[PDB]
Ligand binder design. Structure first.
Ligand code: HEC
Ligand code: HEC
Ligand SMILES: [Ca+2]
Length: 350
């Protein structure tokens, strides 16, 4: 029977009623997440792009799929993903990890894991060909005649992902009362939650996002935001291939709108932004201070501070070098102790 083991302030996540949590399901998912044999040609596991060492992200601006194509976007973290209202960077239709998983697995455009109908069965057989995997699926899905399929692979990995969290940060300790925040950290903190810096509007939930969804959430929030990273045409256009919410609705005023990412482990998940185009957290704050980014040079040139689509809440906010460092100091309190080195989420294959 699954113990959530949550702080007071985190309610349990919504679990799809036909895929209940269990420890057998968790460990199977962990083995499959890290197994290079789930990809079409056997070169990549999920963990290739979602490294533990980096809070389950890549360290690269974009990622490299199993046939060697680049992804159009930066690989976000999978930690805490059980609480995300909408999964990836800009898609209101992906609202379940089970559903989302089909993209990395079967998506071409571009190939990531590289599972097609041509190799579908071949992959599955690889797990039936294995002694240890037969125990696991069997022990995890006991009500099933044939318990190694793709519905079973998705269910397991989904369970694993819901088990990936540790509300372990200095910020979390602070909120529980086990820790005092630094003078710098307090001053960054008061900025973050103040109507000058404004970060709590979009990064101010206990998930440090504004799409926090648990198992009690009714009438969910779900907003998206243009933050003025670009204005390619002088009309607020973001460069192809990343239009954000526009790419799904076709509505012109959703151009450059993205989900606000959770800021948990932000210190560890650089590069930043939807396309990895901001190298450091110092440059991020520079950008918020100016109400947007100005690209002075080449193909991406334009000024996002002046974009028409930009959010109401991002204005020019002349923050002093002091206030910027205090705010940077506060973002560094959002890294987890456990997560990066816990045996629980480590590669089980060595
Ligand atoms: C070679 C690259 C690559 C592989 C392989 C890959 N991912 Fe991803 N992952 C991405 C990128 C890039 C995104 C961002 C997608 C987007 O919005 O365009 C992503 C997004 C996600 C998200 C949404 C997270 C959020 O915060 O909303 C989850 C969950 C996820 N991946 C899990 C998986 C699982 C499970 C596997 C394989 C079993 C997998 N990933 C394989 C690169 C990859
Ligand atoms: C009204 C919306 C809004 C406000 C205000 C806002 N953000 Fe964001 N933030 C976003 C969105 C949306 C993105 C993703 C944008 C993209 O990649 O195109 C983002 C991206 C980020 C990233 C990179 C995240 C990642 O996972 O790669 C950091 C760091 C960040 N914000 C911190 C801040 C700080 C610090 C403030 C204010 C002091 C702030 N934000 C104010 C919505 C906002
Ligand atoms: Ca990143």
């Amino acid at each position: 029977a699954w113990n959530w083991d949550l702080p007071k302030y985190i309610p349990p996540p919504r679990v799809p009623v036909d895929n209940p949590m269990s420890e057998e399901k968790f460990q199977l998912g962990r083995r499959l997440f890290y197994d290079k044999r789930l990809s079409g040609n056997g070169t990549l596991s999920c963990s290739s792009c979602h490294l533990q060492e980096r809070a389950f992200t890549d360290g690269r601006t974009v990622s490299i799929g199993s046939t060697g194509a680049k992804t159009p976007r930066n690989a976000p973290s999978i930690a805490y993903s059980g609480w995300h209202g909408t999964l990836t960077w800009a898609n209101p239709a992906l609202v379940t990890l089970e559903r989302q998983m089909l993209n990395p697995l079967f998506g071409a455009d571009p190939i990531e894991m590289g599972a097609s109908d041509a190799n579908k069965a071949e992959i599955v057989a690889r797990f039936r060909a294995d002694a240890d995997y037969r125990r696991w699926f069997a022990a995890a899905f006991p009500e099933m005649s044939e318990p190694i399929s793709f519905a079973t692979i998705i269910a397991a990995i989904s369970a694993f992902q819901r088990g990936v969290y540790s509300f372990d940060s200095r910020y979390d300790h602070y909120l529980q009362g086990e820790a005092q925040l630094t003078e710098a950290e307090q001053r960054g903190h008061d900025l973050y939650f103040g109507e000058k810096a404004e970060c709590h509007h979009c990064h101010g939930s206990v998930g440090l996002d504004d799409q926090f969804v648990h198992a009690r959430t009714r009438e969910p929030e779900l907003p998206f935001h243009n933050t003025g990273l670009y204005d390619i045409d002088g009309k607020g256009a973001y460069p192809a291939p990343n239009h954000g919410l526009f790419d799904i609705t076709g509505d012109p005023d959703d151009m450059g709108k993205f989900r606000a990412p959770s800021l948990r482990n932000i210190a560890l998940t650089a590069p930043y932004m939807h396309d990895g185009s901001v190298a450091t957290l110092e440059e991020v704050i520079d950008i918020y201070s100016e109400g947007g980014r100005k690209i002075a040079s080449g193909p991406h040139a334009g000024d996002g501070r002046a974009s028409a689509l930009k959010s109401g809440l991002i204005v020019k906010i002349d923050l002093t070098a002091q206030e910027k460092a205090d705010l940077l100091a506060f973002l560094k309190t959002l890294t987890d102790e456990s997560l990066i080195a816990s045996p629980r989420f480590s590669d089980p294959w060595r």
